[PDB]
Amino acid sequence: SIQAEEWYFGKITRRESERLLLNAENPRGTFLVRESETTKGAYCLSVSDFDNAKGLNVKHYKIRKLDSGGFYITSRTQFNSLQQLVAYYSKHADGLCHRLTTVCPT
Ligand SMILES: COC(=O)c1cc(C[C@H](NC(C)=O)C(=O)N[C@H]2CCCCN(Cc3ccc(-c4ccccc4)cc3)C2=O)ccc1C(F)(C(=O)O)C(=O)O
């Protein structure tokens, strides 16, 4: 039950998730999952990043969910649940700006 996972912020906006992520105390990979503002049934993985080029910044990755059942960022790499997706991405950067590290403070 996703509503329960501590990294699931549910119904919060894009701007708010960015206000939470852009804290100077956040190390690369700080993250939360929320509802997509415009695609029903889609979610967004908001992730903090940091480089000398841009400094502290946020990326937003859409997570699709099929009725066949899979959750994914790229259809090539799918998961049976949001949790497993999160777990995978905490060990693999792959196409993400950085691997999932720590849950975003509130
Ligand atoms: C303007 O925005 C939107 O409409 C909107 C848009 C996005 C996508 C996001 N758009 C914005 C304006 O935030 C974006 O472009 N992120 C990039 C982030 C950087 C990577 C590049 N890329 C393409 C891509 C390439 C590779 C991979 C990848 C990842 C892991 C492994 C393999 C490949 C993922 C994506 C993305 O999707 C997500 C949520 C909402 C949205 F629903 C909304 O309603 O705004 C929201 O904020 O809620």
From Swiss-Prot:
Location of this fragment in the whole protein: 145 to 250 of 536
This protein's name: Proto-oncogene tyrosine-protein kinase Src
S-S pairs: none
Lineage: Eukaryota, Metazoa, Chordata, Craniata, Vertebrata
Compartment(s): Cell membrane; Mitochondrion inner membrane; Nucleus; Cytoplasm, Cytoskeleton
Additional remark text: May be involved in blister formation in Pemphigus vulgaris, phosphorylated-SRC is abundant at blister sites but not in normally adherent tissue, which corresponds with loss and disruption of CDH1 in cells adjacent to blisters. Phosphorylated SRC is increasingly abundant at pre-lesional sites of blister formation and occurs prior to changes in abundance of CDH1 and DSG3.
Superkingdom of source: Eukaryota
Source organism (scientific name): Homo sapiens (Human)
Tissue: Expressed ubiquitously. Expressed in the skin (at protein level). Platelets, neurons and osteoclasts express 5-fold to 200-fold higher levels than most other tissues.
Disease note: SRC kinase activity has been shown to be increased in several tumor tissues and tumor cell lines such as colon carcinoma cells. Thrombocytopenia 6: A form of thrombocytopenia, a hematologic disorder defined by a decrease in the number of platelets in circulating blood, resulting in the potential for increased bleeding and decreased ability for clotting. THC6 is an autosomal dominant form. Affected individuals may also have bone abnormalities and an increased risk for myelofibrosis.
Domain annotation SH2: ranges: 7-104
Function: Non-receptor protein tyrosine kinase which is activated following engagement of many different classes of cellular receptors including immune response receptors, integrins and other adhesion receptors, receptor protein tyrosine kinases, G protein-coupled receptors as well as cytokine receptors. Participates in signaling pathways that control a diverse spectrum of biological activities including gene transcription, immune response, cell adhesion, cell cycle progression, apoptosis, migration, and transformation.
Record remark on domains: The SH2 and SH3 domains are important for the intramolecular and intermolecular interactions that regulate catalytic activity, localization, and substrate recruitment.
Protein's gene: SRC
